[PDB]
Structures are given as C-alpha cells and as structure tokens.
C-alpha cells in the first residue's frame, strides 16, 4: 500500500541514477563472464559448438540484488550444485570463488537492482560418443537490470491468467522440473495460448487434472485462510520458499501437495511467485474475476513480508560497490 | 556385403583426401554462417542473449551430403519450413537463397561426406513482454564432416539397445516431436541410462507401453516379413521416409502405427534410422540376442536400397566443388 509505494519509488529513483551512468560505465547495461573475461552483456558471445546451445545440455540458477543487497544467494548456489549433480555436471569453479566473482560483477556494473544468471553447460564435447572423463563443463555468468515478469503497475491491479488447454507441463519422468533448465517448449506454447485467449499468464496442468507452474513462476492459491502450492511437477522456487517463511511467521498454514485444477475456480485469491518480479497477484482467471476481482488480504501480507525479508540479515547481505 | 565394402571404403578414401586439405584450407574441418559471414566452425561465436541459447526457442534441421551429392535436401527444407510455422518462426531468407548458400558452404569446405545443420531461433528479443512485430528471428547454418551415430564397423555386427525405464519421451502435448528441436533432456537421460546398463542406444516409451524414438533416431521393427514403425510421438524422419520408399519398391509392407513395447521382444530384426549414420542394426536388446543375434535379411535389403538412393536423381543432386 504505502509498502508498494516505498518499494517501487526506491526502485525508480535507483534506476534514474543507474541510467545516468550508462554514458560513463560500459557495464551499466549488464556485465558477463566468459572464459574468465568480463565484457558488456550486449557484446558477449559463446561458441556455436557449446552443448548448452547444441542440445540445451545445461542447468542454470538466477539470484537477485535489491537495493545493493543479494537476496538468498546461498540458497540459489546450493540449488545450482544440486541441479548439477542430477545431470552429472560439476560447477567449474569453487563456490566461494563463484560468489566473489558475482559480487565483483554486480559492483563494476553499479546495478543496485539486478537479475543474476549462472549457466553450467556440458561444454564443447557432447555426451553422445565421448568418454565421460574427456568432458569439460563450461560456466557463464551475467548481471543485468532487474527483470519484471509482472510490471510494478500491473502488480497493483493484478494480471489475467488461463488454465492452458493446448499444452501441458513436461512430466518429471521426461525432464525433472526440479532441475532448473531452459527447455521451454511447453512454456512458450503456453505463453502463446495465453496471448491468443486475451490473457498474459499460462497455468499448466500435469495432464492428470492438477496444476503445476507457469512460464517462469510458481503458483499459489488461497482458500479459507490457507495457502496451497503444487509439490510435484514444479521447480522448488526460492520465492515460493520465502512465501512459506513469511506465512509461518504470520501463523498462516501452507500446504505443499497435489492441487487440483478445480481448486483454482473456487479459491479466494491467486498469486504467482518468481525471483524476476517477486509476488504477482492474479485477479482474472479464464476471462472471469477471481472472487470479486480484488487483490486479496493474504496476497498483500505475503507481498509486504517478502520485501521486508530483503532487509533482513538472515536472508540478505550488503554488497560493497568499491 | 560388398555393398557395405563399397560404401565404407569410398568413405575412407575421400576422408584421407579431406584430411590432407586441413593445412591449406581453414574450412576443411567445418564452415559456419553467422550474420552473413563465413568462418571456420571452431571459431563460430553466437550472441549470448540469443533465445536459442536463453530458452532453446528454436527449430533446426540436418540434411546430408554423400560422395558429393546432396541427399533429399528439398525434403529437409520443406520440413524446416513446416517446423518454423508451428513455432511461429520464419526462415529469415528465401529457401532458394538458403539452398545456394549451403551449396557454396559445402564446396568451400571441400567436404564430400557432410553433416549440414540449419538453426532458426527466436532472435535477440524473447517472446515474453515483446510485441510480436518487434521479434527478429536469427539464422545459423554450418557444415561439418559426416557424424556417425553408429560407426561403420559396428554397423557390420549390430549394436546394443535398452528399452528405457528411468525415463520416457516428452509427450506431444508438452512439445511437438514433429518439430525438430534441441530440447534433449529426455534423450540425454536415456544415453546415461543405456550406458549405466552396459548398452549404447536408448529406446524411449511414451509412458503408455508403446515405443517412440531414441536419442537422435527412429526405430523400426521387423516381424514375419513386415516393418513396424511408430507414427505418433516421434519425428517424421527423412531416413524413415527413405526406408519406406525402398520397402514399397521391394514389395515389403510397412505399417506406420502404434507399436507396443512387447513387439520389440518378439520380432525377427531391429534397426534404427537417421541422417547421421543411415541404417543402423540392433542385435542385442536388454542384454539378450535379438532373434539369434545375427543381422537379418530385410535389414540388409533396406541397408542397400538406402545407399543406392543416394545416386538416384529423384532423391539427390551433384554439387560442383569447382
Ligand atoms: C519454470 C519456473 N518455475 C518456477 C520458477 C520460480 O523460481 P524462483 O522462485 O527460484 O526464482 C522459475 C523461475 O524463473 C521458473 O523458470
Ligand atoms: C529425436 C530424433 N528422432 C528422429 C531423427 C531422425 O531424423 P532424420 O531421419 O530426418 O535425420 C532425429 C535426427 O537426428 C532425431 O533427433
């Protein structure tokens, strides 16, 4: 309320000052690490033959900086190592070293509110016809201005979603959704359907009449004081994990379990959650209002708890910009 | 077969001559087209912010050159265009132009036995939060020495497969498999499974007890004089099409339909088919001989028919290397 005004006014203020440095500082529009080299993001180039491109044989993770403060970086670094493990990849540098390069990269950019991406690929030699010991994994890392999956102004009113019906989410026994990946075939078909049906956001089923996740976000339904989020079929979001921390402190029950589609049509409130946007209310579903079409009271306490946590020492730390 | 001798000895002869040119000709190991430029393949670099990298937002296709003759290039071009249409991409150049460039690229490398790849991506601006008319699709093309999914000498004995049980193929209502794509998370999982179980080649199910395809190839079963190949849930291969043309010429019935997993344990012969290898016999399945472990008579007739077609003007044209 006054909390949204404080978050978005501070952002816009910080953005004006970062825009001013675009003249003097060539990393102010983003910075990339490639084969040990720092370059502007618009000029970064990867080998054609990298298997991240050739066969999307990669995982990634995406921490964030708000107001000069890394949010939950170590959760994102732990998830990345665990993602690596499951695809028989290994992070090419020590994690302590990766964390320091990240802090360096944020600081030379001068970006106070940032999207940060780490990519670990199979490398220049592919799986099909190579002995596993000859395989050298490659790292890429980049910082860019914070990205909004829902713009701050649509967050005040709420977006429109559809439950997708031309597409369903890739099932875990084909590709494990707990391994962050860029195989977005289903998600792109869903974004197109959403647009075709006069909406923005797709909600994908598992094909078995339950909900999973959308094109870059988790889903959370609210119903008689209780939050419900799918357990299975979905990426275990660090924004979803924050939702859960905030709820446990406000004494609100969170249920991570199978969530049937039908529950989305008789819930009190709906919101989406991601690092690239935060807490993102849905007020219209399949062309119809969500329980009056207003942004719900619990959605709003979750919203405020989440941004408060960006200033809490347990979840964040201050970067030194020189 | 003197036919296998013919083909693999002609290959080896032309290879020895291509390898000689490697110190005079910097395109002899591969050539790539990037933003209008021709460059050695090992030096080809693509923008990191390409959505082909960022979210595998792409289709591709892979025609062949054998003994200086393009093999069914017009079929692969018509399929690339069908593929682009279904993803709402557009081939960034006319197809007549793309054809001349490819021919120039093969003639400059001096490669007679070539793997040729075309990749159409979404471009530098992602689908999410960009107006459709501002999206500018990118092309990458490259030529390299012929790739063998199964080596010549293993084609003389046959290879080992497993019906996969840790992974199943991405279903068509998540990603359309008629759309050639590089989202190989399921296929890579399969290559690991197969290897962990002392085999080379994975056969993926649909999760509904039918066969689909494997990590870079279609599957074809022979049973009492009849070929059986899956219709649904697979790429519609140009090799498979050739197999089919050769079967009808020889009076052999081909059934393109649902093929149950059971049929693979009670058939007379098995073979895989792809542009990168040709006709590839399987003689051990789940660690047991297939119908006695010998390469079978219809596999052999199909093998020869397929390489005959490379010198037939209905299916191929001679390049001028100049
Ligand atoms: C498919 C998908 N699901 C869920 C999420 C939520 O992830 P997190 O809360 O860790 O940012 C993302 C992140 O962008 C995503 O891409
Ligand atoms: C998954 C998959 N199926 C089938 C094929 C066979 O395609 P084609 O016969 O046109 O090469 C390929 C080609 O590499 C493939 O990747």
Automatic annotation (TrEMBL), chains A, B:
Protein residues bound to (S)-malate 1: 165, 197
Pfam families per record: Aminotran_4
Residues reported in the UniProt entry to bind (S)-malate 2: 168
Binding site for pyridoxal 5'-phosphate: 79, 180, 238-239, 274-275
Key word Calcium present: yes
Tagged with keyword Metal-binding: yes
Binding-site residues for Ca(2+), renumbered to this chain: 67
Listed GO MF terms: catalytic activity; metal ion binding
Gene3D superfamilies: 3.30.470.10, D-amino Acid Aminotransferase, subunit A, domain 2
InterPro entries: Aminotrans_IV, Aminotransferase-like, BCAT-like_C, BCAT-like_N, Class-IV_PLP-Dep_Aminotrnsfr
Domain of life, per lineage: Eukaryota
Cofactors, names only: pyridoxal 5'-phosphate
Keywords: Calcium, Metal-binding, Pyridoxal phosphate
One of the protein's GO biological processes: carboxylic acid biosynthetic process
Family of this protein: Belongs to the class-IV pyridoxal-phosphate-dependent aminotransferase family.
Record's protein name: D-aminoacid aminotransferase-like PLP-dependent enzyme
Source organism phylogeny: Eukaryota, Fungi, Dikarya, Ascomycota, Pezizomycotina
